[model samples]
Target: MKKEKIHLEYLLNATSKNILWSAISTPTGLEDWFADKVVSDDKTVTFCWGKTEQRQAGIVAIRAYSFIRFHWLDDENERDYFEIKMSYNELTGDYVLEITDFSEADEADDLKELWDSQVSKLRRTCGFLEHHHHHH
Candidate 1:
Protein backbone atom coordinates (compact mmCIF):
# COMPACT_ATOMS: atom_id res chain seq x y z
CA MET A 1 0.00 0.00 0.00
CA LYS A 2 1.09 3.56 -0.70
CA LYS A 3 1.86 5.32 2.57
CA GLU A 4 1.61 8.79 4.02
CA LYS A 5 3.96 10.11 6.65
CA ILE A 6 2.74 10.85 10.17
CA HIS A 7 4.58 12.91 12.73
CA LEU A 8 3.89 13.30 16.43
CA GLU A 9 5.65 15.45 18.97
CA TYR A 10 5.17 15.37 22.70
CA LEU A 11 6.51 17.95 25.14
CA LEU A 12 7.86 15.76 27.88
CA ASN A 13 7.27 17.69 31.08
CA ALA A 14 9.30 15.70 33.55
CA THR A 15 11.89 13.79 31.56
CA SER A 16 15.66 13.98 31.36
CA LYS A 17 17.65 13.49 28.19
CA ASN A 18 19.59 10.35 29.04
CA ILE A 19 16.68 8.52 30.60
CA LEU A 20 14.43 9.39 27.70
CA TRP A 21 17.16 8.26 25.32
CA SER A 22 17.46 4.96 27.12
CA ALA A 23 13.71 4.42 26.85
CA ILE A 24 13.84 4.66 23.09
CA SER A 25 17.21 3.09 22.27
CA THR A 26 17.46 0.15 24.60
CA PRO A 27 15.75 -3.25 24.56
CA THR A 28 14.64 -3.31 28.19
CA GLY A 29 13.39 0.25 27.84
CA LEU A 30 11.37 -0.45 24.71
CA GLU A 31 9.41 -3.25 26.35
CA ASP A 32 8.03 -0.85 28.92
CA TRP A 33 6.28 1.42 26.42
CA PHE A 34 6.81 0.33 22.85
CA ALA A 35 5.93 -3.36 23.08
CA ASP A 36 4.91 -6.20 25.33
CA LYS A 37 8.23 -7.90 24.62
CA VAL A 38 11.45 -6.94 22.93
CA VAL A 39 14.52 -8.85 21.82
CA SER A 40 17.50 -7.49 20.05
CA ASP A 41 20.63 -8.86 18.48
CA ASP A 42 23.16 -6.34 17.30
CA LYS A 43 21.28 -4.19 14.77
CA THR A 44 17.90 -5.89 14.55
CA VAL A 45 15.08 -6.07 17.05
CA THR A 46 11.89 -8.01 17.38
CA PHE A 47 8.78 -6.60 19.05
CA CYS A 48 5.91 -8.72 20.25
CA TRP A 49 2.49 -7.45 21.18
CA GLY A 50 1.10 -10.62 22.70
CA LYS A 51 1.32 -14.37 22.31
CA THR A 52 0.89 -14.40 18.54
CA GLU A 53 1.55 -10.92 17.20
CA GLN A 54 5.15 -10.14 16.40
CA ARG A 55 7.18 -7.98 14.07
CA GLN A 56 10.84 -7.48 13.32
CA ALA A 57 12.65 -4.33 12.36
CA GLY A 58 16.21 -3.50 11.44
CA ILE A 59 17.94 -0.64 13.22
CA VAL A 60 18.70 1.27 10.08
CA ALA A 61 20.08 4.45 11.64
CA ILE A 62 20.87 6.05 14.95
CA ARG A 63 22.07 9.55 15.69
CA ALA A 64 23.81 9.44 19.01
CA TYR A 65 21.47 10.75 21.71
CA SER A 66 19.15 12.34 19.16
CA PHE A 67 17.19 9.77 17.15
CA ILE A 68 16.81 6.21 15.99
CA ARG A 69 15.24 4.82 12.83
CA PHE A 70 13.98 1.34 12.14
CA HIS A 71 12.80 -0.34 8.98
CA TRP A 72 10.18 -3.02 9.32
CA LEU A 73 11.11 -6.40 7.93
CA ASP A 74 7.60 -7.11 6.71
CA ASP A 75 6.91 -3.76 5.13
CA GLU A 76 7.39 -3.63 1.38
CA ASN A 77 7.71 0.11 1.00
CA GLU A 78 11.36 1.02 0.71
CA ARG A 79 11.00 4.60 1.83
CA ASP A 80 8.66 4.04 4.71
CA TYR A 81 10.42 3.92 8.07
CA PHE A 82 9.69 4.43 11.75
CA GLU A 83 11.79 6.87 13.73
CA ILE A 84 11.93 8.30 17.23
CA LYS A 85 13.76 11.49 18.05
CA MET A 86 14.38 13.42 21.25
CA SER A 87 15.08 17.09 20.92
CA TYR A 88 15.81 19.71 23.52
CA ASN A 89 15.62 23.45 23.16
CA GLU A 90 17.54 25.91 25.26
CA LEU A 91 14.42 27.73 26.47
CA THR A 92 12.04 24.98 27.65
CA GLY A 93 14.60 22.87 29.54
CA ASP A 94 12.47 19.94 28.47
CA TYR A 95 12.73 17.20 25.92
CA VAL A 96 10.40 16.78 22.98
CA LEU A 97 9.56 13.27 21.90
CA GLU A 98 9.09 13.01 18.18
CA ILE A 99 7.73 10.03 16.31
CA THR A 100 7.81 9.53 12.58
CA ASP A 101 5.94 6.74 10.86
CA PHE A 102 4.10 5.95 7.68
CA SER A 103 0.69 4.43 7.21
CA GLU A 104 -2.07 4.04 4.64
CA ALA A 105 -3.81 7.38 4.16
CA ASP A 106 -7.06 6.05 5.54
CA GLU A 107 -5.31 4.43 8.51
CA ALA A 108 -3.46 7.54 9.63
CA ASP A 109 -5.93 8.55 12.32
CA ASP A 110 -5.85 5.22 14.06
CA LEU A 111 -2.11 5.08 13.76
CA LYS A 112 -1.87 8.54 15.23
CA GLU A 113 -4.06 7.48 18.11
CA LEU A 114 -1.81 4.50 18.65
CA TRP A 115 1.14 6.82 18.98
CA ASP A 116 -0.72 8.89 21.52
CA SER A 117 -1.35 5.94 23.78
CA GLN A 118 2.12 4.61 23.29
CA VAL A 119 3.61 7.94 24.32
CA SER A 120 1.29 8.08 27.27
CA LYS A 121 2.67 4.76 28.38
CA LEU A 122 6.14 6.10 27.85
CA ARG A 123 5.49 9.11 30.07
CA ARG A 124 3.98 6.97 32.79
CA THR A 125 6.92 4.62 32.72
CA CYS A 126 9.36 7.50 32.78
CA GLY A 127 7.44 9.32 35.48
CA PHE A 128 6.02 12.38 33.76
CA LEU A 129 3.81 13.80 36.52
CA GLU A 130 2.12 16.65 34.64
CA HIS A 131 0.84 14.70 31.62
CA HIS A 132 1.87 17.62 29.47
CA HIS A 133 0.34 18.39 26.07
CA HIS A 134 2.25 18.98 22.79
CA HIS A 135 2.45 20.41 19.26
CA HIS A 136 3.99 19.90 15.74
Candidate 2:
Protein backbone atom coordinates (compact mmCIF):
# COMPACT_ATOMS: atom_id res chain seq x y z
CA MET A 1 0.00 0.00 0.00
CA LYS A 2 1.07 3.56 -0.52
CA LYS A 3 2.46 5.52 2.41
CA GLU A 4 -0.14 7.26 4.50
CA LYS A 5 0.46 10.71 5.92
CA ILE A 6 -1.13 11.86 9.16
CA HIS A 7 -0.71 15.42 10.18
CA LEU A 8 -1.57 17.16 13.43
CA GLU A 9 -1.08 20.74 14.47
CA TYR A 10 -1.51 22.60 17.74
CA LEU A 11 -1.11 26.21 18.70
CA LEU A 12 0.69 26.33 21.97
CA ASN A 13 0.96 29.25 24.31
CA ALA A 14 4.61 28.43 24.75
CA THR A 15 7.33 29.81 22.59
CA SER A 16 9.04 27.81 19.89
CA LYS A 17 12.37 28.05 21.61
CA ASN A 18 10.89 26.80 24.86
CA ILE A 19 9.13 23.90 23.19
CA LEU A 20 12.23 22.93 21.28
CA TRP A 21 14.48 23.21 24.25
CA SER A 22 12.19 21.21 26.47
CA ALA A 23 11.17 18.58 23.97
CA ILE A 24 14.20 17.97 21.77
CA SER A 25 17.37 19.55 23.10
CA THR A 26 18.05 17.28 26.03
CA PRO A 27 17.04 13.93 27.43
CA THR A 28 16.04 15.14 30.88
CA GLY A 29 13.39 17.50 29.59
CA LEU A 30 12.05 14.86 27.25
CA GLU A 31 11.80 12.34 30.04
CA ASP A 32 9.89 14.78 32.18
CA TRP A 33 7.20 15.33 29.59
CA PHE A 34 7.17 12.67 26.89
CA ALA A 35 8.92 9.52 28.02
CA ASP A 36 9.33 7.68 31.25
CA LYS A 37 12.94 7.11 30.37
CA VAL A 38 15.03 8.14 27.36
CA VAL A 39 18.47 7.21 26.20
CA SER A 40 20.31 8.54 23.21
CA ASP A 41 23.33 6.91 21.68
CA ASP A 42 24.71 8.64 18.64
CA LYS A 43 21.74 8.92 16.27
CA THR A 44 19.36 6.56 18.02
CA VAL A 45 16.85 7.23 20.78
CA THR A 46 14.98 4.74 22.88
CA PHE A 47 11.84 5.70 24.75
CA CYS A 48 10.63 3.57 27.60
CA TRP A 49 7.25 4.15 29.15
CA GLY A 50 7.60 3.03 32.74
CA LYS A 51 5.36 -0.04 33.08
CA THR A 52 3.28 0.41 30.01
CA GLU A 53 3.28 -1.99 27.08
CA GLN A 54 4.18 0.83 24.75
CA ARG A 55 7.83 1.26 23.95
CA GLN A 56 9.58 2.69 20.91
CA ALA A 57 12.98 3.35 19.43
CA GLY A 58 13.92 5.57 16.57
CA ILE A 59 16.76 6.76 14.44
CA VAL A 60 17.21 10.45 14.79
CA ALA A 61 17.67 12.09 11.42
CA ILE A 62 17.42 15.74 12.39
CA ARG A 63 17.48 17.25 15.84
CA ALA A 64 17.24 20.97 16.26
CA TYR A 65 15.54 23.56 18.37
CA SER A 66 12.81 24.01 15.78
CA PHE A 67 12.64 20.70 13.98
CA ILE A 68 13.01 16.98 14.52
CA ARG A 69 12.73 14.05 12.15
CA PHE A 70 13.01 10.42 13.04
CA HIS A 71 12.24 6.90 11.89
CA TRP A 72 10.58 4.61 14.42
CA LEU A 73 10.52 0.82 14.49
CA ASP A 74 7.82 -1.31 15.99
CA ASP A 75 8.90 -3.82 18.59
CA GLU A 76 6.72 -6.58 17.19
CA ASN A 77 8.19 -6.22 13.73
CA GLU A 78 11.58 -4.69 13.29
CA ARG A 79 11.01 -4.57 9.57
CA ASP A 80 8.03 -2.23 9.91
CA TYR A 81 8.91 1.41 10.30
CA PHE A 82 7.47 4.90 10.25
CA GLU A 83 8.64 8.47 9.87
CA ILE A 84 7.85 11.39 12.15
CA LYS A 85 8.48 15.05 11.59
CA MET A 86 7.98 17.82 14.15
CA SER A 87 8.19 21.44 13.13
CA TYR A 88 7.84 24.46 15.36
CA ASN A 89 6.53 27.84 14.31
CA GLU A 90 7.89 30.69 16.36
CA LEU A 91 5.51 33.22 14.90
CA THR A 92 2.30 31.47 15.91
CA GLY A 93 3.75 29.75 18.92
CA ASP A 94 2.57 26.49 17.51
CA TYR A 95 3.95 23.14 16.54
CA VAL A 96 3.07 20.83 13.73
CA LEU A 97 3.66 17.14 14.20
CA GLU A 98 3.38 14.76 11.29
CA ILE A 99 3.55 11.01 11.30
CA THR A 100 3.90 8.89 8.20
CA ASP A 101 3.37 5.18 8.51
CA PHE A 102 5.53 3.32 6.01
CA SER A 103 4.16 -0.12 6.53
CA GLU A 104 2.82 -2.06 3.55
CA ALA A 105 -0.11 -3.29 5.63
CA ASP A 106 -3.62 -1.91 5.33
CA GLU A 107 -3.69 -0.30 8.73
CA ALA A 108 -3.16 3.35 7.99
CA ASP A 109 -6.50 4.44 9.37
CA ASP A 110 -5.98 2.49 12.55
CA LEU A 111 -2.53 3.90 13.04
CA LYS A 112 -3.73 7.41 12.37
CA GLU A 113 -6.43 7.15 14.98
CA LEU A 114 -4.04 5.66 17.47
CA TRP A 115 -1.59 8.48 16.98
CA ASP A 116 -4.30 11.09 17.15
CA SER A 117 -5.33 9.81 20.56
CA GLN A 118 -1.77 9.53 21.77
CA VAL A 119 -0.94 13.06 20.71
CA SER A 120 -3.98 14.37 22.51
CA LYS A 121 -2.89 12.61 25.65
CA LEU A 122 0.58 14.02 25.29
CA ARG A 123 -0.75 17.53 24.95
CA ARG A 124 -2.91 17.13 27.99
CA THR A 125 0.02 15.87 29.97
CA CYS A 126 2.05 18.89 28.94
CA GLY A 127 -0.69 21.30 29.96
CA PHE A 128 -1.18 22.46 26.40
CA LEU A 129 -4.82 23.25 27.06
CA GLU A 130 -4.62 24.54 30.55
CA HIS A 131 -5.59 28.00 29.44
CA HIS A 132 -6.15 27.75 25.74
CA HIS A 133 -9.08 27.62 23.36
CA HIS A 134 -9.90 24.86 20.92
CA HIS A 135 -10.40 25.61 17.25
CA HIS A 136 -11.73 22.26 16.19
Question: Which candidate has the highest lDDT of all?
Answer: 1
- Superposition-based RMSD of candidate 2 using all C-alpha atoms, in angstroms: 7.3
* CA lDDT, every model vs. true structure: 0.70, 0.52
Please give the distance, in angstroms, between residue 104's alpha carbon in candidate 1 and its true position after superposition. Answer: 4.8
TM-scores of the candidates in the order shown: 0.62, 0.47
lDDT by residue for model 1 (55-119), tens: 77777788775878877777646765768787777786777777786678677767767667667
Q: What are the runs in model 2 whose C-alpha is more than 4 Å off?
A: 1-3, 14-22, 48-56, 73-127, 130-136
TM-score of 2: 0.47
Per-residue lDDT of candidate 2, residues 12-85 (tens digit): 33544445433654567677765568766565566767656654556545445344555555554443444445
Model 2 is weakest, by summed lDDT over 10 consecutive residues, at 127-136
Q: lDDT of candidate 1? A: 0.70
**Cα deviation of 66, candidate 2, in Å:** 4.2
